[PDB]
Design an enzyme around this catalytic site. Structure first.
Site, PDB file in Angstrom:
ATOM      1  NE  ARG A   1      41.971  33.639  41.128  1.00 39.02           N
ATOM      2  CZ  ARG A   1      41.306  32.317  42.116  1.00 39.02           C
ATOM      3  NH1 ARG A   1      41.409  32.247  43.182  1.00 39.02           N
ATOM      4  NH2 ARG A   1      39.912  31.676  41.283  1.00 39.02           N
ATOM      5  CD1 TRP A   4      47.913  39.917  30.609  1.00 38.29           C
ATOM      6  CD2 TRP A   4      49.207  40.409  32.095  1.00 38.29           C
ATOM      7  NE1 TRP A   4      48.859  38.599  30.952  1.00 38.29           N
ATOM      8  CE2 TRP A   4      49.335  39.164  32.420  1.00 38.29           C
ATOM      9  CE3 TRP A   4      50.581  40.970  32.999  1.00 38.29           C
ATOM     10  CZ2 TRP A   4      51.091  38.325  33.159  1.00 38.29           C
ATOM     11  CZ3 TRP A   4      51.598  40.581  33.368  1.00 38.29           C
ATOM     12  CH2 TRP A   4      51.394  38.974  33.135  1.00 38.29           C
ATOM     13  CB  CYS A  41      41.133  36.579  39.058  1.00 36.94           C
ATOM     14  SG  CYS A  41      42.743  37.264  38.355  1.00 36.94           S
ATOM     15  CD  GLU A  96      40.107  40.336  29.928  1.00 37.20           C
ATOM     16  OE1 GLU A  96      41.059  40.377  30.097  1.00 37.20           O
ATOM     17  OE2 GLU A  96      39.238  41.017  31.343  1.00 37.20           O
TER      18      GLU A  96
HETATM   19  C1  HEM Z   1      47.873  39.620  35.378  1.00 33.54           C
HETATM   20  C2  HEM Z   1      46.970  39.930  34.753  1.00 33.54           C
HETATM   21  C3  HEM Z   1      45.746  39.294  35.033  1.00 33.54           C
HETATM   22  C4  HEM Z   1      45.173  38.510  33.779  1.00 33.54           C
HETATM   23  C5  HEM Z   1      45.240  38.443  32.488  1.00 33.54           C
HETATM   24  C6  HEM Z   1      43.511  38.447  34.987  1.00 33.54           C
HETATM   25  C7  HEM Z   1      42.267  38.233  34.061  1.00 33.54           C
HETATM   26  C8  HEM Z   1      40.935  38.478  34.263  1.00 33.54           C
HETATM   27  C9  HEM Z   1      39.650  37.980  34.076  1.00 33.54           C
HETATM   28  C10 HEM Z   1      40.202  37.898  32.284  1.00 33.54           C
HETATM   29  C11 HEM Z   1      39.143  38.303  34.304  1.00 33.54           C
HETATM   30  C12 HEM Z   1      37.569  38.435  34.121  1.00 33.54           C
HETATM   31  C13 HEM Z   1      36.826  39.515  33.236  1.00 33.54           C
HETATM   32  C14 HEM Z   1      35.703  38.297  32.253  1.00 33.54           C
HETATM   33  O1  HEM Z   1      35.378  37.256  32.274  1.00 33.54           O
HETATM   34  O2  HEM Z   1      35.358  39.033  31.616  1.00 33.54           O
HETATM   35  C15 HEM Z   1      39.371  38.170  35.301  1.00 33.54           C
HETATM   36  C16 HEM Z   1      38.434  39.228  36.628  1.00 33.54           C
HETATM   37  C17 HEM Z   1      39.192  39.324  38.183  1.00 33.54           C
HETATM   38  N1  HEM Z   1      40.363  39.837  38.432  1.00 33.54           N
HETATM   39 FE1  HEM Z   1      42.028  39.228  37.007  1.00 33.54          FE
HETATM   40  N2  HEM Z   1      43.084  39.389  35.790  1.00 33.54           N
HETATM   41  C18 HEM Z   1      44.765  40.142  35.844  1.00 33.54           C
HETATM   42  C19 HEM Z   1      45.254  40.663  36.902  1.00 33.54           C
HETATM   43  C20 HEM Z   1      44.486  40.511  37.960  1.00 33.54           C
HETATM   44  C21 HEM Z   1      45.007  41.482  39.385  1.00 33.54           C
HETATM   45  C22 HEM Z   1      45.846  42.105  39.086  1.00 33.54           C
HETATM   46  C23 HEM Z   1      43.845  41.536  39.795  1.00 33.54           C
HETATM   47  C24 HEM Z   1      43.844  42.450  41.716  1.00 33.54           C
HETATM   48  C25 HEM Z   1      45.326  42.834  41.899  1.00 33.54           C
HETATM   49  C26 HEM Z   1      43.360  40.177  39.457  1.00 33.54           C
HETATM   50  C27 HEM Z   1      41.523  40.171  40.368  1.00 33.54           C
HETATM   51  C28 HEM Z   1      40.520  39.729  39.369  1.00 33.54           C
HETATM   52  C29 HEM Z   1      38.632  40.551  40.136  1.00 33.54           C
HETATM   53  C30 HEM Z   1      38.712  41.237  41.460  1.00 33.54           C
HETATM   54  C31 HEM Z   1      38.056  39.948  39.177  1.00 33.54           C
HETATM   55  C32 HEM Z   1      36.633  39.880  39.556  1.00 33.54           C
HETATM   56  C33 HEM Z   1      35.897  41.567  39.046  1.00 33.54           C
HETATM   57  C34 HEM Z   1      34.677  40.915  39.196  1.00 33.54           C
HETATM   58  O3  HEM Z   1      33.534  40.165  40.031  1.00 33.54           O
HETATM   59  O4  HEM Z   1      33.815  41.473  37.941  1.00 33.54           O
HETATM   60  N3  HEM Z   1      43.097  40.350  38.413  1.00 33.54           N
HETATM   61  N4  HEM Z   1      40.567  38.236  35.622  1.00 33.54           N
HETATM   62  N1  LIG Z   2      33.667  35.388  32.472  1.00 33.88           N
HETATM   63  C1  LIG Z   2      32.143  36.483  32.695  1.00 33.88           C
HETATM   64  C2  LIG Z   2      31.012  34.808  33.082  1.00 33.88           C
HETATM   65  C3  LIG Z   2      29.812  35.544  33.420  1.00 33.88           C
HETATM   66  C4  LIG Z   2      29.398  37.181  33.289  1.00 33.88           C
HETATM   67  C5  LIG Z   2      30.237  37.654  33.058  1.00 33.88           C
HETATM   68  C6  LIG Z   2      30.042  39.286  32.789  1.00 33.88           C
HETATM   69  N2  LIG Z   2      30.713  39.567  32.184  1.00 33.88           N
HETATM   70  C7  LIG Z   2      31.327  40.930  31.562  1.00 33.88           C
HETATM   71  C8  LIG Z   2      31.854  41.553  33.272  1.00 33.88           C
HETATM   72  C9  LIG Z   2      30.877  42.373  33.472  1.00 33.88           C
HETATM   73  C10 LIG Z   2      32.004  42.999  34.752  1.00 33.88           C
HETATM   74  C11 LIG Z   2      33.209  42.901  35.346  1.00 33.88           C
HETATM   75  C12 LIG Z   2      33.887  42.035  33.890  1.00 33.88           C
HETATM   76  O1  LIG Z   2      35.523  42.058  34.940  1.00 33.88           O
HETATM   77  C13 LIG Z   2      35.980  42.395  35.402  1.00 33.88           C
HETATM   78  C14 LIG Z   2      37.633  42.124  35.329  1.00 33.88           C
HETATM   79  C15 LIG Z   2      38.179  43.193  37.067  1.00 33.88           C
HETATM   80  C16 LIG Z   2      39.331  42.519  37.115  1.00 33.88           C
HETATM   81  C17 LIG Z   2      40.328  42.300  35.696  1.00 33.88           C
HETATM   82  C18 LIG Z   2      41.833  42.218  35.466  1.00 33.88           C
HETATM   83  C19 LIG Z   2      42.766  41.534  34.815  1.00 33.88           C
HETATM   84  C20 LIG Z   2      41.372  41.857  33.400  1.00 33.88           C
HETATM   85  N3  LIG Z   2      42.533  41.551  32.530  1.00 33.88           N
HETATM   86  N4  LIG Z   2      40.262  41.925  33.112  1.00 33.88           N
HETATM   87  C21 LIG Z   2      40.017  42.278  34.699  1.00 33.88           C
HETATM   88  C22 LIG Z   2      38.536  42.307  34.737  1.00 33.88           C
HETATM   89  C23 LIG Z   2      33.222  41.584  33.186  1.00 33.88           C
HETATM   90  N5  LIG Z   2      31.456  37.400  33.063  1.00 33.88           N
END
Ligand code: HEM
Ligand SMILES: Nc1cccc(CNCc2cccc(OCc3ccc4ccc(N)nc4c3)c2)n1
Ligand code: HEM
Ligand SMILES: Nc1cccc(CNCc2cccc(OCc3ccc4ccc(N)nc4c3)c2)n1
Ligand SMILES: [Cl-]
Ligand SMILES: [Cl-]
Lengths: 362, 362
Positions: free
Chosen positions: A68, A237, A65, A242
């Site tokens: 954070r 948000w 994330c 994304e």
């Molecule tokens: C406040 C705004 C937030 C933004 C802008 C943000 C941004 C992101 C982004 C961009 C990702 C990666 C998704 C991708 O690569 O496609 C991510 C992953 C993640 N975020 Fe955040 N996030 C936010 C808030 C939160 C909150 C509130 C939580 C939980 C309490 C959280 C937990 C996570 C987790 C667990 C992942 C990884 C999920 C996975 O492995 O699939 N985030 N975040």
């Molecule tokens: N980068 C990268 C790098 C390598 C591979 C990928 C795969 N990519 C797509 C994908 C798949 C599954 C989940 C996902 O995201 C989960 C998630 C969780 C919490 C969030 C909180 C806020 C936020 N704005 N987004 C969140 C997204 C993405 N991705």
């Protein structure tokens, strides 16, 4: 000795949690009551204070994330008191409404009863509370292909989509004791959507693109001190990439890049023209412009990466080890224009944290 | 027992190398002669056939290289016969000329005598045979900051740069037995350069950007069957993003993005405008356009990623395990628009391979 895992995790979590809260003197009395509680009942119950801080720690520990920096301002809604489907449904409705906050998204998590002894009390089937259906039969692809299996499962349960490209999936979850989940249509007044326009190119509206305001991840397990909260939907948000670089651009999702190229007036013929690259930028500019213009919170990947640098600095100033997943923290648009790309991160797994879990469907 | 490492590596390399060449019957006689040779002399000498194929294997095994589809067509120049500075210098001159090939770059490696017993015979100081000097004093930054330490070292040896932004560093290398390296100015007739223009935006030439045609990596150690070829410069052709997204864009290199934004007529004020992203695309379009127009080989990252997919398919069809470094194989422009981003790779280290080694300067 399954009990022993739980005693070990509770020792580690309570010690670290009470230390950060300046309650270190109370750790020893609280651990004794905990130790008695698991001996007798097999588990223990978190205080509101432990649950709130544990959810924040879990966010702080999410290696993937980039957002954070704001972990400590997470709005934790404690719904461990829910026992019925209507209460689950209304708490999910309420989460959407309060997290949405008329467009100024509040990072929020609603926490439902945890697993008792591996048995889930509430099992949420949605990947996100708000997301579009996807259909594919007879060669026709409609909507979001990522949602095809869930959509097929919903339609086994009596739900039927309109077959637009943006059908809202219903809430779908199963209660302990029931063989089948229930489903409930989302009140459209609760769901904000954003039409995608471009600041300069009037023809971009001819694409008729839109996305929903709030991503509310609803299928991850929150693990705090050995207690497994399998049902704990949370939201932040969106980062713009994304939507602009993945949801609308992946061939394997809405696959719009070739249509974006046409309306911005460039040819999509030659790799050397970097037309995919140029279309990605204009699409991602449109997403950010559209969310701003409607007043719905969003962050661009440059601002997000600057915030995460402050998170890195806040971590060391606090004496806390930093963990992170380089492969997920870099953004999918100009990653080398962020500082993240040019350093390394320890991808170690620290608890409390959020974890994947098996889907109840396929 | 330092000898034993060498016998072990020779067994593994000769067996695999003769197998791929359909010479498996000869492995056993060749190993005996090898085993006698190290017992007596402490080392062994590769045949031209083993050296050629070993250099190709090393390229095939480079986890970070996206251009490995063409590993088998590497042009191997065997210069293990060189003993003097003039022969080293002329072989380096010749490498530049033949690899350049009037713009149709031939992937080429020139192989100098290996380390004898840890003692280098020839020690090349250049990171690439062709690259620009960098200066920084009195707050002024001139040229390429990546070259500042090498440039300072060259000027300790009697060389003096003109202080343009594109001074060609001289060849600089040290012979065994000598306390100091020698340096030789590059004949400008041998070095192709490409002025960077834009296909649509005439004002892009106001930036007066250029780059050299051929990247010739000259500071890595080629390791084949326990023999360490510390001096073995090689080249492919550029992927466009190396010039457009890193060399000319990094704040820490030429740092041109803000100037690119101005000449393409966009504001560089707001993160949400994605001006860095838009400038990166137009700059990278200019690089590809300019190399093409001059007739100098280059590849865009989409075509390169398609080629690497064929390398992945060629690997499995051949029964060979594939290794790769995801963090280096994704391109720094639209990485999620390539298939590489959406799969995983085993980053295991297989020999023969190319390896980093300590710089003789600091
Ligand atoms: C406040 C705004 C937030 C933004 C802008 C943000 C941004 C992101 C982004 C961009 C990702 C990666 C998704 C991708 O690569 O496609 C991510 C992953 C993640 N975020 Fe955040 N996030 C936010 C808030 C939160 C909150 C509130 C939580 C939980 C309490 C959280 C937990 C996570 C987790 C667990 C992942 C990884 C999920 C996975 O492995 O699939 N985030 N975040
Ligand atoms: N980068 C990268 C790098 C390598 C591979 C990928 C795969 N990519 C797509 C994908 C798949 C599954 C989940 C996902 O995201 C989960 C998630 C969780 C919490 C969030 C909180 C806020 C936020 N704005 N987004 C969140 C997204 C993405 N991705
Ligand atoms: C034929 C055209 C070639 C192309 C387009 C190509 C492309 C690339 C690229 C883009 C990188 C990564 C640089 C970066 O991320 O900034 C790379 C790394 C590498 N390539 Fe290639 N390459 C080619 C030929 C070769 C040849 C001929 C060799 C050696 C025989 C080679 C060995 C390597 C090695 C060892 C690395 C990693 C070096 C390091 O870790 O710093 N490549 N290649
Ligand atoms: N991606 C990534 C991912 C993470 C970090 C980096 C660092 N990035 C800059 C850099 C530093 C050092 C070396 C380097 O490259 C070496 C190299 C070797 C052989 C080549 C053959 C052909 C060719 N066209 N380029 C080559 C480059 C890059 N980079
Ligand atoms: Cl999403
Ligand atoms: Cl370079």
């Amino acid at each position: 000795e399954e009990k022993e895992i739980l005693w070990n995790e509770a020792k580690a979590f309570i010690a670290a949690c009470y230390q950060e809260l300046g309650k270190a003197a109370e750790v020893k009395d609280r651990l004794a009551d905990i130790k008695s509680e698991i001996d007798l009942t097999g588990s223990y119950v978190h205080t509101k204070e432990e649950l709130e801080h544990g959810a924040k720690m879990a966010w702080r520990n999410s290696n993937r994330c980039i957002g954070r920096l704001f972990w400590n301002s997470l709005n934790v809604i404690d719904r461990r008191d829910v026992r019925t489907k209507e209460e689950v449904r209304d708490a999910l409705f309420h989460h959407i409404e309060t997290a949405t906050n008329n467009g100024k998204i509040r990072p929020t998590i609603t926490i439902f009863p945890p697993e008792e002894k591996g048995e889930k009390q509430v099992e949420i089937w949605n990947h996100q509370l708000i997301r579009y259906a996807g259909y594919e039969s007879d060669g026709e692809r409609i909507g979001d292909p990522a949602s095809c299996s869930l959509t097929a499962a919903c339609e086994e349960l009596g739900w039927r989509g309109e077959r637009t490209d943006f059908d809202l999936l219903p809430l779908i979850f199963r209660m302990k004791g029931d063989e089948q989940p229930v489903w409930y249509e989302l009140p459209r007044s609760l769901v904000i959507e954003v039409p995608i326009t471009h600041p300069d190119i009037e023809a971009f509206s001819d694409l008729e693109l839109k996305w929903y305001g709030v991503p509310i991840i609803s299928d991850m397990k929150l693990e705090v001190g050995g207690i497994h909260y399998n049902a704990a939907p949370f939201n932040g948000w969106y980062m713009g990439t994304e939507i602009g670089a993945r949801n609308l651009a992946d061939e394997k999702r809405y696959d719009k890049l070739k249509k974006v190229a046409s309306v911005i007036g460039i040819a999509a013929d030659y790799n050397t023209d970097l037309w995919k690259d140029q279309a990605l930028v204009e699409l991602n500019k449109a997403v950010l412009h559209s969310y701003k213009k409607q007043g719905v919170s969003i962050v661009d990947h440059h601002t997000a990466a600057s915030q995460f640098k402050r998170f890195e600095e806040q971590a060391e100033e606090a004496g806390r080890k930093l963990t992170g997943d380089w492969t997920w923290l870099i953004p999918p648009i100009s990653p080398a224009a962020t500082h993240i790309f040019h350093r390394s991160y320890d991808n170690s797994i620290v608890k409390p944290n959020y974890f994947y879990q098996d889907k109840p469907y396929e």
